[model samples]
Structures are given as C-alpha cells and as structure tokens.
Target: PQVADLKAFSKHIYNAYLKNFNMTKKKARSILTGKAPFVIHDIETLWQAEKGLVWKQLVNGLPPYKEISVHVFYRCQCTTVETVRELTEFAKSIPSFSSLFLNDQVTLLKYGVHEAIFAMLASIVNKDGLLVANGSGFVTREFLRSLRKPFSDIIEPKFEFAVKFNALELDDSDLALFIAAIILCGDRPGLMNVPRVEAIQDTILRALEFHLQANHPDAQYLFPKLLQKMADLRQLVTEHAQMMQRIKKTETETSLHPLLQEIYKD
Candidate 1:
C-alpha cells in the first residue's frame, strides 16, 4: 500500500483506539493519567479497586492470605489482563493487522502483546512509578523493591525504561503511532509470512520517519530511539515472562488470566 494509505490507516486505528480507551469511566481514566503506577493501601481502596482497577499480594509458608503485597501483585495482574484485552482489540481494529491469518493473528498477539503493553506502560508510568488500582495511589520504586523476589523484580526495569522513554515527551498522537508500529512489527517471533508483514511494517516506518522529520526536528534522534525502545521492550517482555513463570510456580494464591497465561507460555 501507499505510504499515504499506511499513514491514514494507522491514524484511523490510532484515533479509534484513543476514543475506545478514553471512553473508560472517569475514575478509570484518572488511573490512566500517569500519576500513580501501583495502588496498594487498605480495605476501602481495595474495595474501590474491584470495579475500577481489579488486580494483589503474597505471604509466608502459610500462603499469601493477608498481605498488602499480595493485593498489590494481584492488582498488577488484573491491570495487565485488562490492558492485554484492550490491546488485542486495538490490533484487530487495525486493517493491516486484522488482515493476517487467524493463526498469525494469534501468533502475533501471543508473542507481541506484552511488548505492546510495556510500550503503553511507558505512558501511564513516570519516575515515581506506575499508577496502580485505578490511580488511587502510587507504588514507589523503593516499595516495590522491598517486596518479595519475582514480584519485586517484575516492575523494576520496566520503570527504568519508562522513565527514560517518557523523557522523549511523546503525547497520545505520537504514542498511537508508536504503539501501532510496535504491534504491527514484522519481526515478532514466529511470523510465517515475513515479507508481506514486513512490507506493511516498512510502509509504517517510512510514514513515521517522515512525520518525525517534519514535526520533531529538534528530536530528529527520536525516531531511531523509538525503534530502539521496541527492541528494549521485547527484551523487557522476555524478562517479564521469566518473572511470570516464577509467579505461576510459587504463588498459587494469585491467578493469572487465561489469556495472559496462554500468551506468556514460554
């Protein structure tokens, strides 16, 4: 397809995504605003989170029955499952992506959804950390670090990448394209028809590169750096899956969404 059509198609999907994502309830939108990353407090807020952010903690040999840490971990899981569902919808909304074979679609999502979520995670995240439980509170880096092993390590490098990625100052329009680029990549593992996918992907890259040159001249470097983030995010998802594997083995109290489990099956 022409670069013009590619850009137009990407913009169409991006706009569709923005509207769908923002159509979220007011309180939920607040959580999306990048203030607090993780929300772990007391019972009342936990109650509020059930509908708003629905996501938990861990404990001793007795099992993770009564710990805020367990709640926080569950919070993160719920949020990831929610994000993954929306992302799958967002990808389907894109013409080029939906055009893929059903197996390829599943393949792309299984391998690349986490990479895409981590990309958007940069949006809701700042230096303080990511918002949890629908923006009711922030989960500080120090606090997350103080948690147990796999859960603690789960978010550390993510915030590290997010803080730097946020420094680029890409707004929603920019992120829309950036995220589309991330999802539509031809290089995600197990792509059967690489050339066709690459062709569509190349069109997006050309369109994105031209736009970057036109709009962000001062940050001409941003385009390449954004590509680099795609690479970084893929690596991040690898580590994320490793952490998830450990969680599945040791943390029985918390449950992962089946979609999340299927995608993360390593």
Candidate 2:
C-alpha cells in the first residue's frame, strides 16, 4: 500500500517535530531576551568554570589545551546525546518509523542521528553566533574559534554549514519533514529491510517537495537546494566523525559518552 497521502503524512511529522524540540526558531524568536547572563563565550570564564584539570595541565608545562579540548568536546557530546534522545523521540512519533522492525529502527538511529542532529542544529544557528543553553545564551563564532585546533575545527564547519543553511529560512514544519527524511534514509548500513525504509523515505521526500513548493511558492529550486544541503550535511558528519576518532586516539584521556561511542562505531 504505497499510498502518497502526503497531507496526513506532513501533518503528523510536523506535530512530532513540534513536540520533541524544546527550542525551535518559532519559539526562540518569541521567548529569547536579555542575553548577557547566559552567554558562555570567554576562554577565561570557561577555564575558571572547569579549572581543576586545567590547573593540573598548567602544572605539567602544557598550555591547558587538552583540558579545554576535553571540556568542549565533552560539552558538545552531552548536547549531542540529548539531541539523540530528542531525535529518537521524533522518529518514534512518525507512524511508519514505529512499524519498522526494532533492529531496523536501531540501525537507522545509529547511522542517521548525527545527520539529523546537525540538520536541526541549523535552527538555532546564524552567521555570527548560535544559541546555547536552550536558546537562553548565545556563543559568538569568535569564541568557538578561539579554542585549540581540531577542537575549534570541529565546531567551525558546523557554524559555516548552519549559516548557509539558515539562509533558506525554513520554519519548523519544513525542518520536521527534512529531519524525518534524514533519519528514515535507506542507505544506512545494516538495515533489515531497505525497500521498506526506502519506500517510507520516498513518501517523506514527496511530502517535503510538495510542502516546499506550496509553502515557498515564490522561491525556486528550494527542494533541490535542500537535497544538496543534505549531501553537504552528510559530508559534515563524515568529517566530524573522523575528527572525533582522531580526538579519541590522540587524546586518550578524553572521555566520550558510551552512546556517542556507539553512534560513532564502525
């Protein structure tokens, strides 16, 4: 039963998206105010906050670099893990997603969650800064740039991607469908049933394509451009995964979350 039924499909995913994300651009635009107290951009402030290990690094004739890298990486992974939970909730809310075999579901979640997270990451991001602490705080792009190498590199491209992706001005509804397509992808390794997943993905893409045309009637090539963005997002994940691996190797003392280790698992 390959029914198109884009109408119902689109509405369900939109509701799920709305329900899962605590902060959306729609809500952020309305609620965010008085940014000074929440901002956490300064290096000295971060070091002060996490100074014990950083102090130890200073004693060792090191530049406190590893401590900062580990702290930022840990902070980032914590955010990533939370996003993973939100994404899993969002995935389950989709009607077809729950119908997949449990193993197939996990397989998709493992491979696609990073891509989905990065896609949604664009929502809170802009050219000069991104919202953190649930949109209560903004971290300047320059602050993230001030971090040590590999660590700084890790976050910079995401901001770059987000700045460009934000140019599309897609609301939560468009992002809901876009993220749905990202997770339900057929190409993920170890899927139990590719055709079933592909069928679902095709339907989601159809809903997105039609939704974009009507919602963005004045805009041209938006759908294809989004498809291209997905490709770019995939590259972003690949590069990110590689960097994390390097961090794991070179910075052996850095603790990675078990769930993140699982997601990055080959």
Candidate 3:
C-alpha cells in the first residue's frame, strides 16, 4: 500500500522526473512502484535509497502499462535548416554571436541555436545555486534566494520579447513557422520546472532586446518592425496555449486502460 507521506513527496519527485522524461501519469506511478530496475535505481540513487525499494516492489507486481503518443507538428513556412544556417552564418560575423555559439557544430544541431542561449542562462542559475547552496549549507532559504536572480533575469526578458514578437505582421503560415521555431528552441532540458516555456519566451525577448539595441540608421523604421515581431510572438503564445488546453481536455475526457486508470486516479 502507498503511504500518504510517500505519495506526497513522490508527487513532486514524479513531476520533476516527468519534466525530464515526459512520462505519462501511469508510467510515473509504475516507476515509483519499482516496476523497472532502471527507474528504481535512478530514483533511489537520487533520493538516497529511502523509497527505491518501495517503488521496486510496487512496480514488480503491477500489470503492464501503455505509453501515450504525442503527435508534434512543425508549422513553419521557412525551412528550419535554411533559416538556422542563415542565422548561424550571420552570428559568425557578429561578436555577440560568438558568445552565443561557442562552436560551429553546436549551432548546427537543431536544438543548438536555442540551447546555446538557454545553456548560458542555465549555467548562470546553476552557479548561483552553487553559491547559495555553499553559503547556506544547502538549506531551503538559500536555495530559493539563489533561484530569484536567474529566474527574474531570464523570465523578464522573455515576457518582454513575447510582447514585441506578437506585434509583427507576418502571414499566418509564416508566423506559425516562426512561433514553431521559437517553441522548438525554448524546449530546454532543465533550468526551471518548464524550461521549454521559459526558453521560448526568453529567446523571443532577448532577440527583441538585441534588435532594439542595434545601431541602425533608421531608428523609426526599426522600432516599429521590432514591435511587429513582438506582436507575432504574442499571437503564437495565445494559439499554442489554446492548442495545449484542447489536448489536455481531450486527454482528460478519454479514459486510459483499466489497470492504468486505477494507478493514475488521484
């Protein structure tokens, strides 16, 4: 039987684990129960062995579970490869691009362009976490405080960029493609809980900030253009949110298999 205390901590553990693995609720529960040795080992190692055994035992006797299939569509008008390559080449000429792209190949990877920026922010937060963890002996107080700086710096820029990108007047398909790229880039491994969402917003905001700061001779023309881009981003987020909500609703209404349903019911 699952103890209340175990279930409580396991919820947080499960969420964190899913953020990394994208597992379904049923799968998460099975892993928690110890169905697979690998999952048991991974969680046990992290939690220092207190709960691993419980998970292992629970999972071993459970019925087999089914995996959820997530269908992802890339809706961009411009070819991602071509646009990325062009942007990369442009970055090569710019000094800031060098800092953004440490290596040429890193830029070549589909996720590299976005990851570069996210990694930088992640590194900053990780360093701050280290500093606070060291100073406060890994206590909660220091950990929360350390998170403030990076989260603010990273998220603020992202919110601002969303404002700017949504203002652009691109065609629907083209805009969708642009938003898709931003979303793709935003899917960071781990910085905050939903690094993907944060990364998407952050990338757009930073790009806008960069555009605004550029020393263009036609200041008036540039400012409006930047605002248009911001508008487009806003539209993208709105649409994305709606789509996600629909997905959630559909998932909620549809029942899983009997065994899986039993395991997932709160």
Candidate 4:
C-alpha cells in the first residue's frame, strides 16, 4: 500500500470506529462524572438501574432467587455481546477487511473480538468505575470486587489494563486504528492465507506507526508502548478465557450467553 493509501485507510477506519462504537471516551467521561442519570453500585441502585435499561427482558435474573453476582455477570455478557456487534460492523467497514473471504472474516472476528472489546473498554473505564447502560449508568469497580470468586476475578484485569492504557492518552482516532490492527491480525490460528493476512496487518501497523509520529510527535516510544499493551491484552484474554471455563464447569447455575459460549469454545 502506498503512503497516501495508508492514510486514507486509517482515516476510513477512524470514521468506522466512531460510527459503530456506541460511546467514546469523551462522552463516557462526561456521563460518568455528572452527565449520566444514575449509578449502580449497591443492591438498591441495581434495582433502579434495571428499570431504566429494560427493553428486551424486564429482569434478566430472578431478583429474589438468583444472586447479585449472576446479574452482574449477565450485564457484563450483554455489554460484551453488543461490543462484538460494533466490532464486526467496524471491521466490515474497512475496505481491506471486506476483501477477505467470508470464512476468514469469521475466524478473525472470533479470535479478535475479545481483544478489541478489552481495548475499547478503556474508553468508558477509570480507576474507580466504568460507564454502562449506554452511558446512562455507572458501575463502580468496588461493586465488582464484591462479587464471588471467579466471577469477580473476570473484570479486574481489564480495569488494570484500562488504567495503564488510559495513561497513554490516545483518543478515539488513535484507538480506531489500534483496534483495527488487533482484529486484522495475521497471527490468529487457522488463518487460511497467512501471507496475505500478514501483508494486510503490516500495512495497518505501518499506518499506525506513521499516524502516531504525526499524532504524538513529542511522545517518544508511544508506538512501541502501544504494541506492548496489545501483548498484555492477549494475556488478559487468556486468563479471562480460563476463568470463564472454570465458571462454566463449577458455577453450573450461572448461564453463559450462547454467543459468548461460541467465542470462548475450546
């Protein structure tokens, strides 16, 4: 790809990202601080939050019978499923991405959506909490910490990653390209055309590097630092997958979303 072509592709991806992702860091910040109508951090608040978010199901859990952790996990999975949809739309918007065969596209999405989800999650998250319910409500990190063992464990790493990733201060534009890079990765297992995929990934990486130089001229080593975070996210996803498996085997009462089950299947 030419230099001019890379710039155009990067810009296209930024637009796709903005269009598909329901919330951005700028919007989430405002919502979390004071703009949002409510926050859910305790049992009482959870009830309030539920009434506002009800559309598909009035109550995902049997409030009186099921545990709080189950509801929390349910919310988490629902949000994750929505993010996967946004990621798919974003990927499809990329010209290079749509050029791939259908099966390859599915493989990339299956392997890559979780990585992109964690990366984008940093936008709505801070050290204390994250915005949920379409930025209408906030959920405190402390509240999550109060959940049961493996269930509680699932979210903490993402917060840890978000805290560090946020320190880099990349805005939506930068994140757009970064997320595209994650999904279009050539190294995912079972890729049919390794070199072609690798070539596409290299082009995206090149664009990201060039964009960073112009976008953050004074910030030394920012591109490499961002790449390191990608590696960190992979490990985070691995741990999350393990914990999910543990939950599946031990927490038989808790249900996994079918879409999530497919994504996490070994």
- For TM-score, the strongest prediction is 4
Span of ten consecutive residues with least summed lDDT in model 1: 54-63
What would the TM-scores of all predictions be? 0.80, 0.88, 0.22, 0.94
Q: What local lDDT score does residue 5 receive in model 4, on the 0 to 100 scale? A: 79
Better candidate number, 1 or 2, judged by lDDT? 2
Better of 2 and 3 by lDDT: 2
| Residue range with the least summed lDDT across 10 consecutive positions in model 2 | 54-63
Specify the poorest-scoring 10-residue window by lDDT in model 4. Answer: 55-64
**Residue 147 of model 3, lDDT score:** 32
Rank candidates by TM-score, best first.
Answer: 4, 2, 1, 3
List, residue by residue over 183-229, the lDDT tens digit for candidate 3.
Answer: 33434333233443454355444443333333233345554564455
**Candidate 1 Cα misplacement greater than 4 A, ranges:** 1-7, 22-66
Give the alpha-carbon lDDT of every model: 0.69, 0.81, 0.31, 0.85
Residue-level lDDT tens digits of model 2 in 82-194? 88888999999987999999999999999899898888888777676676656546667788898888788899989888878889989989999999999999999989899
* Per-residue alpha-carbon lDDT of candidate 4 for residues 88-201, written as tens digits (9 for 90 to 100): 999999988899998899999999999999999999999998887677677889989988888788988889999999999898889999999999999899989878888988
Over 4 Å off, model 2: 1-4, 30-37, 47-66
Model 4 regions more than 4 Å off: 33-37, 53-65
Model 1 lDDT on a 0 to 1 scale = 0.69
- Top-lDDT candidate index: 4
